[PDB]
């Protein structure tokens, strides 16, 4: 049912690019020991005008206007609203008055209106490796690989899935990735879903092992693509590091999807050890009524792509690529820990990416 195609293509573009508006270390480094978890550690609301970051176990809350002129000028300080000491942070994000704030173990919430009140919202009874919020929900991916539904109103939790190694979500879909690298989809609807459709890897690509290409990614790019990642299983505690990963991009037209690979989409190329996540921001309407741009970025990479919905497009000059930094103590590629986008401040959407190190850089992409 599934079938392999040709490779997807690279674009060159004259219309895209990026502007470096700035860097500067915000927040303290995880001097290379990060929590074994995908993280999500940096999120945006452009309503309030607010950030939530947490690096090297300190977490913070603080003003927008602020950090945009902390990084672009070299002319005011870095103050913040509130801050505390929480060692495992994973994830982080604004939900109507309130920040959640999740480690591995349990999850918190910050009321924004009495800053004073920081909760635990609950415990989990075995380690978490990826949160997503979507509506009033949390959707949760264990450690003993099970997906689950916390309602954020009730409290209550519901168990969607099993034997899943990466999920993602929108408003309106829910994909998975499985143990044995097969891929399912459903309708999703406030915690509510209907299986949508269903696959399996191609025969050409069953024949990578397992053990050599394991299940590492999905991503929803649209209701009928996504990106898939392979590469080698890492582990918790280890020195030293390289990743070996193979990218795809899944079409599917008509109860059949095709399967075709890239080299293009954040080559990983990282020397920390990471837990393997995929960081998508999308920009509906950078180029048209049913075109979204997509920025990637990788945990184990150091580059930023762009996907326009249909091709990955590289902007037609140097200087025009988003690339986090160089460290400059331990002349080690750095990677994301976070991801947002800045629609609202003053000086093209602003996407705002969060270092191993605690460094935050802003990046203008235009037209």
């Not at 009495?114 to 979507?134: A, G, H, M």
Request: charged share 20%; glycine share 4%.
């Amino acid at each position: 049912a599934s079938s392999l195609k040709d490779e997807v293509p690279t674009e060159t573009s004259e219309d895209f690019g990026f502007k470096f508006l700035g860097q500067k270390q915000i927040l303290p480094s995880f001097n290379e020991k990060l929590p074994f978890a995908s993280l999500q550690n940096l999120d945006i609301s452009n309503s309030k005008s607010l950030f939530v970051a947490a690096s090297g176990s300190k977490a913070v809350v603080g003003e927008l206007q602020l950090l945009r002129d902390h990084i672009t000028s070299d002319s005011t300080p870095l103050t913040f609203k509130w801050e505390k000491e929480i060692p495992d942070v994973i994830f982080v994000c604004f939900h109507g008055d309130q920040v959640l704030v999740s480690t591995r173990n349990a999850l918190y919430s910050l009321d924004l209106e009495e800053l004073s009140e920081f909760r635990t919202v609950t415990s989990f009874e075995k380690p978490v490796f990826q949160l997503k919020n979507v509506n009033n929900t949390l959707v949760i991916l264990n450690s003993v690989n099970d997906l689950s539904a916390l309602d954020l109103r009730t409290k209550s939790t519901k168990q969607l899935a099993q034997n899943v190694t990466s999920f993602d979500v929108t408003n309106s879909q829910l994909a998975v990735l499985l143990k044995d690298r097969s891929f399912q989809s459903f309708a999703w609807r406030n915690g509510e879903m209907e299986k949508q459709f269903e696959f399996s890897l191609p025969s050409e690509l069953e024949e990578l092992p397992v053990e050599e290409y394991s299940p590492l990614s999905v991503t929803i790019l649209s209701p009928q693509d996504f990106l898939a990642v392979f590469g080698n299983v890492i582990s918790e505690t280890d020195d030293e590091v390289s990743y070996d990963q193979k990218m795809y991009i899944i079409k599917h037209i008509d109860g059949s999807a095709s399967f075709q690979e890239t080299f293009d989409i954040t080559p990983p190329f990282g020397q920390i050890v990471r837990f393997p996540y995929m960081y998508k921001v999308t920009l509906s309407g950078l180029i048209e009524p049913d075109a979204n741009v997509n920025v990637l970025a990788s945990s184990c990479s150091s580059e930023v792509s762009i996907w326009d919905s249909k091709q990955v497009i590289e902007p037609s000059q140097d200087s025009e690529r988003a690339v986090l930094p160089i460290s400059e103590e331990t002349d080690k590629d750095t990677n994301p820990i976070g991801v947002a986008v800045d629609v609202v401040t003053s000086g093209l959407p602003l996407v705002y990416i969060l270092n191993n190190e605690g460094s935050l850089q802003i990046v203008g992409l235009f037209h």
